[PDB]
Design a binder for this molecule. Structure first.
Ligand code: HEB
Ligand code: HEB
Ligand code: HEB
Ligand code: HEB
Lengths: 92, 94, 98, 97, 98, 96, 95, 100
């Protein structure tokens, strides 16, 4: 159940390097952003994640909270996977 | 996270729990297997991974090798995702 | 040239004599046959093509459908070339009985 | 499809869009040209084909002849596909300054 | 006779005096040289070869790194023989100008 | 050597000079003619051939069509040889 | 029609893909080879033809000559057709 | 380089392993042997070489002598290369049994 600054940043690097498309979906679907360009996961915490978005407003940073609290990095991956699939359906 | 049986255990249990569909795709496309009732992941290593496509009353021990060897845990996740994408594409054009 | 049953006969003839290896790949990767042996393109259609695969089971006549429909003879070659390349990548991550 | 000037137009069109990479291989291996920018198949004949590699000081108007003469459009492609495989092998064992 | 710098000098002598024509073929085929007046073999290394081409531009030292690495002096002769034969096939398709 | 009107003349002349007997068999078996004295090949098309026969009636211009269409001169020769062999077999197993 | 090395390749093809039994009959009744297992026509020239009976000891490269000279490809066909007839006659004989 | 038992074994080996065709040529042309099956270079000497041809009826040990004596291993290669081109030339002009 370890969610530290280091744990968060490796998780955010994997997402920013292997699943950058999903981060864009998070900002558009969950963060009601339209012109998503270079969406990045800045940090993730047991409660939510912080997304640096580059949209019409500019280079701002938003926060998306997870309904069920996260305990460990695995709970993060499962939630991120589920949110991306659910977000993929709304966008279509 | 470098090559170590313990790190491989967590990875094959994460895939066996979160991406069991991908394991099934591996057995059908790469393993040339037709009757996949329950495809499982027994082990992984830089050369290749070892899959077990069993059945209600059967078992298949198979080995799938990665073209380019894997060094750490994040490269294993990059190869697996890409392999699932390649297998997901084959299922479409058939 | 627009897709025609006569044009298909010409395409299948070229494939069986100049690119017979690809036909074998198509039936392993897209037809999921294990044994390879000889491989023949019996006919091609705007929706898909029919292959006669000699396999572990034996003489089988299977059909492989193209995701995007084919319009002319040129699209046939382009799809055939692309499908063979995709099979070449899968074949490179081959398997073996442990 | 017996060799005719009209057939050549079709073949050169197919090669310049679907197999332009092979045309590049032809010019370097068989044409002995090093600076390859845009390799094109202008025309093909039963004796040979004319490739164009536009470069500094004018387009490389060059002629590569097929050792054994071609009869139909199928015979042309058979020759081409084999010339490109010989070009893929040679290019692998390439040289450099 | 595993590859060594002394062994390379020996090999380059045999090729440079008994198979000097083949050296020209190497430079033309593999080194994409067109005019050849005197082709020479400076040195051979486990993975490659250094050639002096005295033609076309002029003084010109090129290197043909073999796609297959060598193990001994025998691999050099076998590789050199095979490369010359393969180069002979390209020579059969003459390249000219319009 | 794809079938062309110039190629047809070349094939028909060869057939009329080296295999005139076979042309007679075609008219009897495939053209169902009886008393053939001289048989000649006029033209060969991708789909069929024209035969000039002298039978029980007078000079007759008949047409014999090949079940499978012919593409080149080689298919013509192979088809002609097989058709002559089939006619040669009927004469062996035929009576009247 | 004019007998050229290119024409010979065309002629040998016809007699080797079709009427292949004719080539073997030739090197048996005109040629003096007894064990014929793969008779092949390598080349046709004006004076004769280079028959090759690939065998255990060696490809029996053997030459048969045409008493009457050949003029064009047509004379070749006429000469070949007639030679196969004397071969269906000498090959199948009584005792 | 200089004439030695091992020098002969490695030249005859290089020949039995890389140029077995040339050994076959040397026998047909120079040794007047015909219908050769397995031609081999048993030994090479400054004066000549000993070739072992295998024939349908009986094996053969023939000797082909070099007009000008060989001094070192390099002279051996240069002599064989020449004899092989000569035999190739004689190979192009092939005879056959005539019939009518
Ligand atoms: C977006 C969402 C998502 C998705 C969709 C995915 C999808 C995926 N994936 Fe993932 N992952 C993830 C998210 C994800 N993912 C995460 C978050 C993680 C974690 C990371 C870290 O921790 O850093 C992972 C992780 C991971 C891993 C590792 C594990 C260990 O290390 O133990 C692997 C192998 C994978 C695979 C995979 C695959 C094959 C796929 C396809 C099916 N993955
Ligand atoms: C498999 C796949 C494939 C491949 C790999 C190929 C490869 C090739 N290719 Fe190919 N193609 C093809 C498929 C193909 N292909 C097709 C399908 C076609 C069409 C045919 C018909 O139409 O018939 C062609 C066709 C063709 C042509 C045309 C001919 C005529 O016109 O008739 C040419 C020229 C060529 C070339 C070529 C080359 C050079 C190569 C190498 C790179 N192609
Ligand atoms: C180009 C390529 C090539 C070729 C073609 C050849 C071809 C030949 N070859 Fe040689 N080789 C060679 C490259 C060569 N080669 C080399 C590299 C060697 C080695 C050298 C040294 O080691 O130094 C030899 C080596 C050799 C030897 C040895 C020597 C000693 O031991 O010292 C001999 C004998 C010979 C012969 C010969 C012949 C007979 C022939 C046929 C013509 N070669
Ligand atoms: C009827 C059917 C038939 C038959 C049976 C035959 C049979 C025969 N055949 Fe014959 N062919 C023919 C039909 C035929 N065929 C044709 C169609 C041709 C083509 C012609 C033209 O193109 O003109 C020939 C062609 C021919 C040739 C070529 C010539 C030139 O180039 O000009 C020769 C060599 C011959 C041989 C022969 C022989 C040896 C025989 C056996 C006796 N053919």
């Amino acid at each position: 159940d370890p969610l530290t600054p280091a744990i968060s940043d490796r998780i955010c690097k994997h997402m920013n390097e292997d699943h950058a498309s999903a981060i864009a979906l998070y900002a558009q679907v969950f963060g009601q952003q339209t012109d998503v360009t270079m969406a990045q996961m800045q940090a993730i915490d047991p409660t939510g994640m912080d997304l640096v978005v580059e949209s019409e407003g500019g280079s701002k940073t938003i926060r998306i909270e997870f309904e069920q609290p996260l305990k460990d990095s695995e709970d993060a991956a499962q939630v991120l996977i589920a949110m991306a699939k659910q977000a993929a359906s709304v966008g279509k």
